[PDB]
Amino acid sequence: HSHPALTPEQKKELSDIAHRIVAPGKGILAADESTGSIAKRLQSIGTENTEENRRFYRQLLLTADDRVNPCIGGVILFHETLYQKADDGRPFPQVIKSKGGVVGIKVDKGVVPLAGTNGETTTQGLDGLSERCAQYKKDGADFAKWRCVLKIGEHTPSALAIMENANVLARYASICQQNGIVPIVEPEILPDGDHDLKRCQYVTEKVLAAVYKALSDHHIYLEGTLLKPNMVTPGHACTQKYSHEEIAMATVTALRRTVPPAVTGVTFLSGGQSEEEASINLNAINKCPLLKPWALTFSYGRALQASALKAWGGKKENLKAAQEEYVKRALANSLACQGKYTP
Amino acid sequence: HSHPALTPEQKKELSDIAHRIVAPGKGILAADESTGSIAKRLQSIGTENTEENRRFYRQLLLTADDRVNPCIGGVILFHETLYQKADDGRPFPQVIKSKGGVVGIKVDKGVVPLAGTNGETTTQGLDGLSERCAQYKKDGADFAKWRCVLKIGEHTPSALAIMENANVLARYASICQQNGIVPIVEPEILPDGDHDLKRCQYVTEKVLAAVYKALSDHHIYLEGTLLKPNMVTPGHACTQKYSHEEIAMATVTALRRTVPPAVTGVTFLSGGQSEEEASINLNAINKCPLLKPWALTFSYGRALQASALKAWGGKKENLKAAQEEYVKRALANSLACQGKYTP
Amino acid sequence: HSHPALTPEQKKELSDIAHRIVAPGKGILAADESTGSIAKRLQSIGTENTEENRRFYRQLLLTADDRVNPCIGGVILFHETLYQKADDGRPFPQVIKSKGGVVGIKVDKGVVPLAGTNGETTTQGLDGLSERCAQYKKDGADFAKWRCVLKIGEHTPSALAIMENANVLARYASICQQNGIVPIVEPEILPDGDHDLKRCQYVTEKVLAAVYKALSDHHIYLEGTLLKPNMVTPGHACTQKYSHEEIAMATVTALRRTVPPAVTGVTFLSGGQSEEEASINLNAINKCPLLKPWALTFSYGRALQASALKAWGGKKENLKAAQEEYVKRALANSLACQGKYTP
Amino acid sequence: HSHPALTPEQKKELSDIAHRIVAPGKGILAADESTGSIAKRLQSIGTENTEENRRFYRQLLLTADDRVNPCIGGVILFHETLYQKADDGRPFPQVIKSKGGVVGIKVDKGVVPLAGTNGETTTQGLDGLSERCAQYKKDGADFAKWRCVLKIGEHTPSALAIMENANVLARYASICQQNGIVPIVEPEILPDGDHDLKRCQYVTEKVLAAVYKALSDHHIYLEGTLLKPNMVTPGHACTQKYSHEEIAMATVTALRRTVPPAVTGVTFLSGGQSEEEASINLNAINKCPLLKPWALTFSYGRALQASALKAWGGKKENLKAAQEEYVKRALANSLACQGKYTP
């Protein structure tokens, strides 16, 4: 029976947040890497993984020039970053909002193995998620991020993994929407393996169909959600070479066959692509002649900050230089999400 | 695993047929009523239900002026009509094709009760459907029609009815696409009852989500399919009055939340609406400010031919007059599917 | 909601028929092979496939000694055999009932390919099945047979094939139970391939779980049903040798993990096993020390009549001899279904 | 594909624990009530809800006479009780094991609302459940308890609630079995409402079918699991009176139609029944003439300790008396689970 999960005012709030995140020319800066994840990022540049270094790097990303304001519609933060402060004394959420960007929080608690599967996982983090989301909403976080991991193999992704990940994503989205937080569904399919483009497209279509069936079953307000899928690309070990136009065609075709138009926007992850590769693929996707009812933009981590982290080197004097390496990427992707990028 | 149900050439054929059926300004004339169904239509005008009278009425519909050529993209026929001939000696499929329209065939074999349900039904007709579709393809039928019936009640549509009807529609679509015939999925939700607009929208969203999940599970090529849903309208016994704009908003919202953009077009059924009511509702749907990635047109039976059948009266002398009553409707709906209709 | 598909009297009738079919010491003679299927059986012994030869062979099977009366609880017939007559003038159903056996009819219309799968099939025959079942009930048929075919492969049985076959079996069972006919669900998994015992057990468990979930979803009265599964055996090309006790353990374990106790009985198919092999495997299954709440008996075709067909040779003079070859098998299996067989 | 979740040794361990818990004549003492839940229990007898009072009450339950040793096969504990000590200096798990009983832990973290439903809930507690289960296994807990709550209403239990609760139970069971802990699935259907026996039986059958389908999908080793369902009883507000034999018939029928024989045992919850009512209903269930392949015993909370808590009164001097009130119940239920109870 029609028991409304959300009032019209709650739906208005969620839809407004979702449309603000993915406004034309804008994408998402994925800076939500945890302490353990950022450890290798800092060690790659010879930097000790301390609270001060993480805080300074996040400040570098969040205190860039005003040129990134029309490029960044949202910033995903780790829990620690949400309650950290810039040198000027402003909390990071306030800095993000003053730059005209929405604030999001990573709320998943990592992946856990699924027994009886060939190394497949689901993701945890539903316990106490309502109270956590309420606190994040009070603290300025207006959207949330949740990442499910599927992998292509001889017998994977199996039915169990796809079903469980879709169900978990739907539960997460329901809790976030009940707490006034726009959920970003991220059913990432790993590009590991030697699978070709066609297999990736098939797997992505199946996964997205299951995800949106689960979202329908859980009464999810699609207008107040965002999709963060993998780009349809061959496996890293695949021997067949594919053009950017072919990758864009496969990605847009996979989205058009599974993603309802009510979904506000699609924010692609990079999944190991280089910065230029991610920008070119996003630009080709946005130049695809097919009809794309949703916004197609970026939710980029390494692809927005690899050059910034390289130029920083972990030392204070390189800050400005590193910031430039970030800005030039954001602008680039700001063009890529509009189909106007040219290297 | 990716086992292709269709070759690229088969997909090209199906996509071309689907796009030809629902080309801008064009819709479907639903003239597939069986001998038993047309019995009451002929008795309403005092006409004996004989083969000659049915043949002459179908000829009247199919031999109208050339003004209906840019309005009719497809004509659904009953099995008897497929092998009948006009007075000039042309078989009816040839007449339809010479008018620039695609030929479709009703392939379902009626509804049968679902045990353990509150009067819910599924539909039969899968046995030998492959050979029947092959014969229809040889005989000029390029698309097929299949109608599932759901009804809104206190405990209906139940999970069993929705699941069974979606599965049957997916099986039918798979067989038709294997035989080079574009399937039209018609998950009609009956407007009987006193339910309001919101309940109809909720039920339609659930049904369409289940239908498209089933189509994904059965490897259906969505670009070579068409959707024939009910318009989201209140029950006939509902006391609350709704505007045409509200009906259009609810219908477009229900479609946008469940129908993937890959679907070539949406051809609405009338479900008891009067001719003017159906045209006005279709026009309001096409004037909806929301984004509609698929074509929104008509697949009308009574709403295209009620005035024609009334003006005919079962007598030879009224033919031309009756034809006019048909043409004026087609033109009207040809405007309604473009949002350019004005009574 | 609880909408009763069956009245208590209908349930009583179905339960009584089901318990009569699988009474202790009794099994099913599967003589439902169609004209095309029996063609190779008759050609193996140099016999023309004519109506008279099929009628005489079926009479040979159905007019054996009274020693088969406590061994045969049911006989499955093809449509042609249901309306054929013995030499004495008795219709075959009357002969079967006078021998104390229940009459069943094959109601499925063969297998059809599932598009998008690696050679997987579903089975058709639902159209007009209610009227056919009503006629068969009038004509003396008290149970029905329906066979779904799954096959073990690298990517088979897929989710689509298992789901579709379970749904079709549930629809068939619902129609039969509405017409007062006990349905025998036969989800046969083909022993073709080189898969081992463990893979067959896993596949059988998954298939049976899906089948009984489908039966629950379709409100099937399990007490008025029978299960006809494949024995859990390795593939014919498997190199690993297995004992009879291991086959019995795997089969009983697969049944105990998926088959609700409400199911009246399990009537195993042979699936290519020799007559002695089928009897020994059934005996080992019935000697399994695990708890078996349902009756475990035979529904044998070739394994009950291969020696009879060999001894017959298609000539009139061998009738009695052929009958003996049948009787000795029935008695054997009558012991095997009680765990009292000893070669 | 057959990817073993458990090794044969892990399966042996789980099966041995499960069979030890539900050995003939034995049941489960449910003493896992949290601090908040036991608050009203202690306030009903005028006792302050402090750590010492809870510890002393749990000691009273766990240090009863040796007469309860052949009656108690397992004791469920709250987290606090697992690490509390008796007056003699023995930790409570050691006391339980020395009494010949298995130790279980409540691992669910309470219920949370399901949005879009008529007051339906799921249950949380999966996050970090693997590490928690490993610690509990080290600390002497050999089984775990997880309780899903469904309620019968006009539109409840809906498809979403049943599916989500079954999926959560399957995830919990998989994690517990990976950590060597026997999971007790408790899909409790609340007896609140005015529904009759037939509606409760229908709902219980649907819920159990979904639960065991989910367990099959999650590769759950059924032999190493236990079921803790509600007894099939009418709603508390139902006006129709039912006999104990009718309740037993409905319960056993619901179990026989959905619970595979591989399930080691069924440990019924009380759900508000009085102590004598629960014992009489369990005795009638065990006296049911139907075939019951699994052990049918008790997992009782209030129904084993209400008289003990009443006789205790929160004062030290009543300990022995209170213990007697517990023992007389355990013995009673020890007879009830064998069908040998007589009030």
Taking the C-alpha atoms of residue A93 and residue A77, their distance in angstroms, rounded to an integer, is 9
Question: CA triplet B206, A127, D157: central angle to 5 degrees?
Answer: 40
Question: Regarding beta strands D27-31 and D295-300, do their DSSP bridges make them parallel or antiparallel, or are they unpaired?
Answer: parallel
| Nearest by Cα to D312 from D38, D28, D76 | D38
DSSP states of D85-141 as a string? B-TTS-BHHHHHHHTT-EEEEE----EEEPTTSSS-EEE---TTHHHHHHHHHHTT-
**Would you tell me how many other CB atoms lie within 10 Å of the CB of residue B247?**
23
Which residues touch B169 (CB under 8 Å, ≥6 apart)? B146, B148, B183, B185, B187, B211, B214, B215
H helices then E strands: how many in chain A? 12, 10
Taking the C-alpha atoms of residue C314 and residue C60, their distance in angstroms, rounded to an integer, is 11
What is the identity of the amino acid at C42? L
In a mutational test of the C interface, the residue from B117, B120, B126 whose CB has the highest number of chain C CBs within 10 Å is: B126
| D184, β-bridge pairs | D145, D226
Report whether D97 contacts D71 (CB < 8 A).
no
Taking the C-alpha atoms of residue D99 and residue D74, their distance in angstroms, rounded to an integer, is 10
Closest chain A residue to D174, measured at CA: A115
Which residues touch B168 (CB under 8 Å, ≥6 apart)? B122, B123, B126, B146, B148
Q: Binding site annotation covers B171?
A: no
What is the identity of the amino acid at B63? T
| B80, β-bridge pairs | none
What is the identity of the amino acid at D333? N
Give the resolution in Å: 2.2
Taking the C-alpha atoms of residue A85 and residue A94, their distance in angstroms, rounded to an integer, is 9
Q: Which residues from chain A sit within 8 angstroms of residue C154, using beta carbons?
A: 154
| Nearest by Cα to D319 from D99, D85, D36, D87 | D87
Cβ-count burial of C98 within 10 angstroms (0-12 exposed, 13-18 middle, 19+ buried)?
A: exposed
Taking the C-alpha atoms of residue B233 and residue B203, their distance in angstroms, rounded to an integer, is 11
> Is B216 at the interface with chain C, CB within 8 A?
no
3-state secondary structure of D53: helix
Q: Which two tokens stand for residue B273?
A: 């609406």
> Is D159 at the interface with chain B, CB within 8 A?
yes
Burial profile C196-224: b = 16 or more Cβ within 10 angstroms, e = fewer: bbebbbbbbbbbbbbbbbbbbbbbbbbbb
Report whether A283 contacts A341 (CB < 8 A).
yes
Burial profile A140-169: b = 16 or more Cβ within 10 angstroms, e = fewer: bbbbbbbbbbbbbbeebbbbbbbbbbbbbb
Taking the C-alpha atoms of residue A341 and residue A335, their distance in angstroms, rounded to an integer, is 5
Task: Please indicate the experimental technique that yielded this structure.
Answer: cryo-EM
Domain ranges across chain B: 1-343
Q: Binding site annotation covers C265?
A: no
Radius of gyration, CA atoms only, chain A: 19
Report whether A253 contacts A285 (CB < 8 A).
no
Q: Which residues from chain B sit within 8 angstroms of residue A213, using beta carbons?
A: 209-210, 213
Q: Binding site annotation covers C256?
A: no
- The residue to which tokens 């209170």 are assigned: D322
In a mutational test of the C interface, the residue from B169, B171, B176, B225 whose CB has the highest number of chain C CBs within 10 Å is: B171
Taking the C-alpha atoms of residue D83 and residue D90, their distance in angstroms, rounded to an integer, is 10
Radius of gyration, CA atoms only, chain D: 19
Fill in the DSSP letter of residue B290.
S
Within its chain, how far is the Cα of A20 from the centroid? 15
State the angle between helix axes of C197-217 and B159-178 in degrees (0 to 180), rounded to the nearest 10: 120
State the angle between helix axes of B197-217 and B244-256 in degrees (0 to 180), rounded to the nearest 10: 30
Taking the C-alpha atoms of residue C292 and residue C268, their distance in angstroms, rounded to an integer, is 14
Question: CA triplet D185, D190, D193: central angle to 5 degrees?
Answer: 165
Q: Which two tokens stand for residue C64?
A: 């054996």
Taking the C-alpha atoms of residue D273 and residue D276, their distance in angstroms, rounded to an integer, is 8
Q: Which residues from chain A sit within 8 angstroms of residue B212, using beta carbons?
A: 209
Closest chain B residue to C119, measured at CA: B3
3-state secondary structure of B248: helix
State the angle between helix axes of C129-138 and C159-178 in degrees (0 to 180), rounded to the nearest 10: 50
Taking the C-alpha atoms of residue C172 and residue C218, their distance in angstroms, rounded to an integer, is 10
Q: Which two tokens stand for residue D341?
A: 């109870």
C-alpha to C-alpha distances, B39 to A112, A145, B34, B46, B47, nearest whole angstrom: 63, 60, 8, 10, 9
Q: Which two tokens stand for residue B178?
A: 């294997």
Q: Within 13 Å and on the Cβ side, how many CA atoms surround C231?
A: 32
3-state secondary structure of B201: helix
Chain D adjacent subunits, 3+ CB pairs under 8 A: A, B, C
Report whether D224 contacts D264 (CB < 8 A).
yes
Which residues touch A88 (CB under 8 Å, ≥6 apart)? none
| Nearest by Cα to A229 from A212, A216, A246, A243 | A212
Chain B adjacent subunits, 3+ CB pairs under 8 A: A, C, D
C-alpha to C-alpha distances, B173 to B14, C122, D34, nearest whole angstrom: 11, 15, 55
Burial profile B48-80: b = 16 or more Cβ within 10 angstroms, e = fewer: eeeeeebbbbbbbbbbbeeebeebbbbbbbbee
Q: Where are the beta strands (DSSP E) in chain A?
A: 27-31, 72-77, 102-106, 111-113, 121-123, 143-151, 182-190, 226-227, 265-268, 295-300
DSSP states of D181-210 as a string? -EEEEEEEEE--SS--HHHHHHHHHHHHHH
Report whether B4 contacts C114 (CB < 8 A).
no
H/E stretch holding D31 reads strand D27-31
| C298, β-bridge pairs | C268
> Is C130 at the interface with chain B, CB within 8 A?
yes
Report whether D169 contacts D188 (CB < 8 A).
no
Which residues touch A131 (CB under 8 Å, ≥6 apart)? none
| Nearest by Cα to B163 from C36, A137, C167 | C167
- Is there a contact between D202 and C259 if contact means CB atoms under 8 Å apart? no
Q: How far is D287 from chain C (nearest CA, A)?
A: 17
Cβ-count burial of A251 within 10 angstroms (0-12 exposed, 13-18 middle, 19+ buried)?
A: buried
H helices then E strands: how many in chain D? 12, 10
Which residues touch B56 (CB under 8 Å, ≥6 apart)? B316
| Nearest by Cα to D30 from D338, D254, D333, D342 | D333
Q: How far is A117 from chain C (nearest CA, A)?
A: 13
Taking the C-alpha atoms of residue D147 and residue C231, their distance in angstroms, rounded to an integer, is 37
| Nearest by Cα to A66 from A307, A303, A323, A305 | A323
- The residue to which tokens 């006296």 are assigned: D287
| Nearest by Cα to B178 from B127, B228, B131 | B131
